[PDB]
Amino acid sequence: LERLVGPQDATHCSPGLSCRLWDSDILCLPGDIVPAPGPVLAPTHLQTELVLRCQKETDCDLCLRVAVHLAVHGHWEERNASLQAQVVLSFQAYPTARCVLLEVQVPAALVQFGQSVGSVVYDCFEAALGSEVRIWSYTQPRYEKELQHTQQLPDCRGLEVWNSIPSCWALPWLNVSADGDNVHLVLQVSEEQHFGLSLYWNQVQGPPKPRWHKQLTGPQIITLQHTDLVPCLCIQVWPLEPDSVRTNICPFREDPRAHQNLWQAARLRLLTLQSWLLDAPCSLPAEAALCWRAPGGDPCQPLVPPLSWEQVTVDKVLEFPLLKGHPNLCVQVQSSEKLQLQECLWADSLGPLKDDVLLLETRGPQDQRSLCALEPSGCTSLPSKASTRAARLGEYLLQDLQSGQCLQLWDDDLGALWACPMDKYIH
Template identity: 75%
Template structure:
């Protein structure tokens, strides 16, 4: 990226002498050698594969030391990028075993030469450069005259211009030969960074202290740096230094990054992501994650950052309890946030839910299709397992496990096993999943619930009839008393008639009064008032 002079002064120190960086003009990479050597830079990148160690056939050129230097690659007068120049120092490794081998090696190196002393030693040197998230490898070809080939002696160096890098980046450089005659050299270097931004704690909140000179105008941006897709800006403002900004701890997520740059042309932006290991940021990330329903069988997990999570399907029964993992288990999906995912189901069902977990810990669960397909249903999930000879078996997924339909277990699925098997064969169950290994069926249980309630009502009616009959049996004494009362009233009426027309026959009066005494003596009830005149008359 372009580097203005005042940014380099901030990055490399206040001494103006530091600004005298060498400038490389032109966008092309180049290579040059120390006097006496000849070198060539191969076009294009090469594979960064060192390969295995091999034995040297005699004296060979190998890298012995790496040296780096910061330079500027300028496309125009004010359009410059920071670049890492790499110098590889070379030496001769190995010895001749005998003069005949030396003669063969020299003639093999250049068969057109008649004199062996004019033969040259050739080597292919690989430079590998890594600065997250980029990697770049180049191939350098070097030739050394035979006069300089002295085993164990340095022969010079080759300089490569140059690997572009950003301020504050950590770069790693490797060098080895092809084929590889010895262990590769490596060098790690931390490039200078702009000391503008400092992050500190303020209780539960976070303070961003921007050490910018007075009246210096700069831009500040907060963004979410996602592994997939472009960065997502969150907040941006143009400010005047110095500044102290406070962030709420609830806004912290692991991928929240801060970018600062001066409001001048071709300025370098300094970026840091200081909350990658913050426990609060990881908790906030899961709170901000949302499962979103998409038509049919699609769904998506929206989150500001990438999540190391897996998603599986489970079956949620209407009566509550834990969500039962589907058996046989469907493939576990690695969650890619903000991307549409689809499970291999033929049909959707409101009882099918999605569980998102990380490191075997359940983070969230949603029955995604309940909004479009209605509330949970009292359906029974049947699991069909198919064998190699087309012999299959059916079991019902219950909290105690997968219960075989034709079993003597005391579960609902076992009691209704034959009826459920007939429902599957008659097409009354919904097929959710089908493969060579088996299938999943959702069988409605409504009709069995209606039958159960009908039996309950019938039992209630039978109980009421029995109670009524018992009540009638308990009321026999009451019936006797009422019958006696009726007879006494009738007898009283006859007595009134006899007062006016003469006494009734003696036998008739005795017959009418005798049953009354008998009933009264057995029932234990008080005598009715209507019987008193009859007794007095006697």
């Protein structure tokens, strides 16, 4: 009846019949079919119920209960009319296989030609989680075609299947504690457990970003600094056994501190004038654009327009839009519409910050050249009557520009960017 059988094998009969289990894993041969010499018992249909064979409460496994239905077949000929039958049960769960012989005695009262006698039940063929098992049934002599039955077995993903089976709980348990001012990896395994532990940074394309690997003998508590936290920091655990199941967990995906540290570790690097790279532990969606830094310090004004915020992908080469590099040109990086990076990539190569004014010419209709100077207090159209450095020098800068004393940084059908040195006027 029960979903729980003991550790010993046992047979079960429908009322009236008598079944004796004769298995010690016999040498079962279906053999050839023989003409029946009168009424024979015949296996009609196999039915398999999944069951749990427990040798103790901790040690439990999936077991397969098989019920074999029998009917009176063979030739019709008009203790006396009792019918004997010896029923083989063949089980094949690749790689292993086992054979079970059962013997049924059906009393005369149950012997009605054509109709059933009932069933014989077998507890049970033990098989591995997720295995595909095949069963065959037949009598010996064989009077008909063998019955066949194929079952796919459940994975640890089943209810009962979890708490009682060790192949489901004896897995490397992981818990996290960010309360001890540091980050703790609580590894709940048995004292005797040998296991592989790997801390990795889960990147999009070509995910391996190795950080740590340790063959251990648990249980252990691996302590990390809250400065080592990144959103793509994932843990991989597995017992050091061939084909053991690996458990992966990414618990920092939306952690505030992780994202905080992610940008602290992010760096912009120059490969060549027209090649730059974003280096970050994790790959978050971001937008990047060129910025103009003044020699007065950090107040860096982005050049949108005429330029645009383009999507930046971590560990992918970014080809600069402009024709000429400038020490005052910095690359700005924003994610979730918040500024995260501002590396002035031409400060070491072409540096330091030059005292140059940036002019934004815009060709109007009739190809009219309209000049504007990028100043701390916005863009001022030249020449102007403003009490600002570039407006005061407007007429001199306009002469510099058209006399070709200014460096062209960017050219387009709609406009141009110009770097005009002020050094001749400020000193």
